[PDB]
Amino acid sequence: EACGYSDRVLQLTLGNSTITTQEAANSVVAYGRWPEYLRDSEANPVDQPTEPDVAACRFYTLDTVSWTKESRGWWWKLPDALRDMGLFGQNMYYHYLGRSGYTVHVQCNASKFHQGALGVFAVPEMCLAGDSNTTTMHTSYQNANPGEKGGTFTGTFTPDNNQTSPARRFCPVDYLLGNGTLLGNAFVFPHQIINLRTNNCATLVLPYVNSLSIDSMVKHNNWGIAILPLAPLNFASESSPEIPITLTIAPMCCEFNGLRNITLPRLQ
Amino acid sequence: EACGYSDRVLQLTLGNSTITTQEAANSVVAYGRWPEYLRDSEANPVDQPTEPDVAACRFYTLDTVSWTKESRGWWWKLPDALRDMGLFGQNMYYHYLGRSGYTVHVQCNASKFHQGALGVFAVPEMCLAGDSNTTTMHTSYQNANPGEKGGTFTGTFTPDNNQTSPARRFCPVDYLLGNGTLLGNAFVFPHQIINLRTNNCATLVLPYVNSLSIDSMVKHNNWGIAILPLAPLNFASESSPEIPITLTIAPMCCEFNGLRNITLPRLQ
Amino acid sequence: GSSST
Amino acid sequence: GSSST
Amino acid sequence: GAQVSSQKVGAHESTINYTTINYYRDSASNAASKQDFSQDPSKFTEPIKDVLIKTAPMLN
Amino acid sequence: GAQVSSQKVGAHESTINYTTINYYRDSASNAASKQDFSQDPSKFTEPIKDVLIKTAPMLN
Amino acid sequence: AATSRDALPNTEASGPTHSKEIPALTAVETGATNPLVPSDTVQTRHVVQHRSRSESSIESFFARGACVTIMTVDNSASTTNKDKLFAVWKITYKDTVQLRRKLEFFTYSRFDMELTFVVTANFTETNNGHALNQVYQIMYIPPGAPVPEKWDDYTWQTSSNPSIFYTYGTAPARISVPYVGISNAYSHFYDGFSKVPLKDQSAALGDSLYGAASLNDFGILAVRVVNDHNPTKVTSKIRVYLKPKHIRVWCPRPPRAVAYYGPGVDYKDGTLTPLSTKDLTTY
Ligand SMILES: CCCCCCCCCCCCC/C=C\[C@H](O)[C@H](N)CO
Ligand SMILES: *C(=O)CCCCCCCCCCCCC
Ligand SMILES: *C(=O)CCCCCCCCCCCCC
C-alpha cells in the first residue's frame, strides 16, 4: 500500500499481548480454516462449556532453544507444550474435554551475512516413531509429552537395547520426519520456511483439527510442530555459529467441557 | 401454589451444581440487589475482563464444622474462604483485580426433638478486632485470612501478652460481634436464622459491595459471614449433643482484570 | 432569572 | 438584565 | 439565577418562601438545600426473594 | 448585568447554577471564570509536516 | 417523590375481626421484619397524621459541625534546644469520638466537607509584657507535598497548596472541600490490607496494618503563627470543626457499643461491659 502497508510487516494482538514483525513472509492459515468455537449443529457434550477467552487466548512464550551447525531439528505437541501456561493450562487440567485452535509464531533473526533455512511444519496427528526394535507403540506418556521443552530430531536411528528397563522414548529420524515418511514431502502439511536472507519468522494459524468435535486434551495431542534445518546455519567463516529460536504460541477459540477436580498427571 | 410450590422447598442451580432443600425459610437477597456484571458506565480498568462463568460460578462446599453446647460461633471472609476453590481461586490469583457476588447456603439439619437457633449474618467490610492491648490494627494477613476453615468467636476477651512474639490474631468476642458493636443489632445486616424447629438452612444472595467497582481480591475481603448460636443447641436430655454445620457457597457474576503471573501469597 | 420549587 | 451560560 | 422555595411554616403569627443565590462556581461551596427524599425501608426490612403478604403465613 | 452559569455538580445531596456580577470597570478586577477551553496536543506531539497515520509505518 | 418533610401515613379506623388472615403470626427466620401497623392487631380510630421524618433525613442527622482536633501552636523565640512551635495534624475524623460514632452507623459515605476553625490565644507567663494581634497560617499539605520542618521554612510560600491566613479575633475561618476520595465512596471500614505478603518475599517486606488502606489518606494541616516572636509568650489553639454537607450513605451497621481504642475496630480489656444490671421481671 501507498500508505506503507507490507506483507513483511505485521502486528498480531490477542488478549493483553502483541507481536510485531518487520520481516515476515506473509502468514499461513492452515487448510484455509480460521479457528472457530464449536457450533450447535456439531456439538456433542451437553453441559455449558467454559470459554476462558482473553484469560487463555493470549501469546505464551516457550523456552528459547539454540540453532547451531549440528542441530538436527526440534518438535513440540499441542496442546502439550502449553499444559503449564497460565490459565490455559489450568482450564485444560480441570476439564475432561477441551478444544482449541492456535496462532503459532516462530522467531529467529540473524544478519544479512548469515544464511540458513528452517522448515516449520504444523502436522495434524503428528505420531512419532519409537526407539525399539523389539516392541512397537511403546513410547511412554512421559516421553511422548515433553511439555514446553519439546523434543528433538536425530540424523540416526539408534534402537534401545536395554530390555530390562527400556527407555520408552521416541527416536525421530529427521529425513524420515520422525514417522517413516520422507521429509521432502512435509510441505503438504501447512508450513512456512524461515530462510534468513528473506524472513525472520513463521506464523501459522491453526484450526482445531480432529475426528471429533472435542476430545481429551490430556490424553490426545491434535497438532505437532516440527522445525527442521532445510539448509544449515552458516555465518561468515565461523566454525561454530549460533542463533536462537523462540516459539510464542496463542490458543484461540478454546472451550472446555466436563468440569471436575484437577488432573494431576504423572509427567516424570 | 395448588400445584404444590412452597416457600420452604427450593432448588438452586448454578453451573454443574444443584442444591435442594425441603425446609427453607424463603431466601434473602442482600439489600434487594441481585449480583450483576460491571456496567460500562461504572467501569474502571480498561482491559478486556475475564469472566469464567460456569467454571467459577458454581457451588463450592467448605469443610464441615461441628455445633455443640459449647460453641460460641464461627466466621469466614469472602472471597478468602474460596481462595482455593477450583477455577475461581485460580482466576482470583492470576489477576490483580476481581469482583464477585455470591449465593451463600448454610446447612444444618437436626430433628423435631432438637432445639437451637443460628443467626447467619452477611456483613459488608466485616472488620474484626485484634488480640492486643498494647497495639491496634496489628492482626497479620495470615491470621486475618484463615481460608476455608474460617475462624471462631469467643465469649471472652483475652489479650495477647507475649510482646516478644505477638500472636497477631483476632480476638472476636461474640456479644460484641467481634467488632465492638452489640450482637443484638447484627440483624440490620442481611441475615437469616436457622431455628431448628422451623428450618434447616439459610440462603443469602450477596451482590458485590464495595466503595469501588473492582478491587484486589487478595488484599481485600468484601463480605464476612458470621454464624452465631442465638439460642444454644439442645437435644432430649443429652449433656453433649452435636450437629454439623455445612457451608456451600457459589460465586456469581465474577469478573477479573489485570492478568499477569500467579500470586503466591504467604499464608502461614 | 428565577427558579421556583 | 441576565446572561445564561 | 435566584432560586425560590417554600418554607414548611411551623408556628404562625398563603405559602411563605425563601430565596437562595449561589455565589461560587464549585457545588461543594453551596449550602445544603435540605430538600431531601425518602425511600421505603424494604431493602433492609423485607430483603426476601419472595414478596411478603402480611396477612398470609410468612411460611408456606 | 448578572451572569448565570452552571456548576458541574460533584457530590449530590436538574442543573444547579451560580450567579456572578462584575462590580468594577476594569476587567483586571474580575474574578477568574474557570470556563476554559481545551485543545489538541498536536502542535507539540505531532509537529511533523506530513500527517501521521498511526496504523501506517511512520517511515515510508 | 416522597420527601423527608412529608407527613407520615394516617391511621385508618379499623373494627373487629375474625378471619384466616394472620398479620400477627410471622417467622423472623426469613430475615424479614413483619411490616405491622396498629390496625393489624387492635381496633383503631381515624387519625390525620401531621408528623414528619424531616429531622432524621441523613442530611439533617449530620448537619452539624463537630470538633475533630485541637492543634497547639506558640509564638516563642526559637533557641538551640527548642524551636518556635508550629503544629502538624493528619486529617481524620477518628481522633475524637462523637462524629466518628455517627458516621460509623454506615459503611460507606460521600460528602462535601465544611471545615470551620475556631482560634484562641493566651499568655502563659506572668510578665505584664504584651503581644500584638496574631495572624495564623493554616496550610493544607496533600500527600506528597513537602511538610514544614520549621515555622519559617520555604514550604509556607504555598504556591500550590491551599492556605488560610486567619486574623485573630475575627470570625472563625471556613472553607469547603469537594468529595475528594480516590474511591467512589469514602470507606468507614476496610476489611483488608494495603499489601499482599508474598512467599518469595520476607515477612517484614510483605507486612502492613490490618484495615489500613492509603497510609496518608487525606494529608496534613500545618498551622503556624506568622508573626515574629514577642518578648512575652503566647500560646494558641486551633479547634477544627468538621461538617459533612451534601451527604449520601450506604450499608447500615450497629453503632459502637464499647469505647474506641485506636483508628481500627479494636477494643480494650476492662471496657467491654456497656450494659447495666436489670432484673427480667422488673419494670
Ligand atoms: C486550607 C484547608 C484545606 C483542608 C483540605 C482537607 C482536604 C482533605 C479532605 C479529607 C477527607 C476526609 C474524609 C474522612 C475520612 C474517610 O472517610 C475514611 N477514614 C475513609 O476513606
Ligand atoms: C440570577 O441570579 C439573576 C438575578 C440576580 C439577582 C441579584 C444577585 C445578588 C448579588 C449576587 C452577586 C454574585 C455573587 C457572586
Ligand atoms: C444587571 O446587573 C442588572 C441587575 C442588577 C442586579 C442587582 C445588582 C446587585 C448590586 C450590584 C451593585 C453594583 C456593584 C458596583
UniProtKB/Swiss-Prot annotation, chains E, F:
It is found in: Virion. Changing G1A: 100% loss of myristoylation. Impaired viral assembly. It comes from the Viruses. A lipid is attached at G1 (N-myristoyl glycine). Changing A2H: No effect on myristoylation. Severe reduction in specific infectivity. Coiled coil: none annotated. Myristoylation is required during RNA encapsidation and formation of the mature virus particle. Lies on the inner surface of the capsid shell. After binding to the host receptor, the capsid undergoes conformational changes. Capsid protein VP4 is released, Capsid protein VP1 N-terminus is externalized, and together, they shape a pore in the host membrane through which the viral genome is translocated into the host cell cytoplasm. Interacts with capsid protein VP1 and capsid protein VP3. This is Capsid protein VP4. It comes from Poliovirus type 1 (strain Mahoney). The chain holds residues 2 to 69 of 2209 of the full protein.
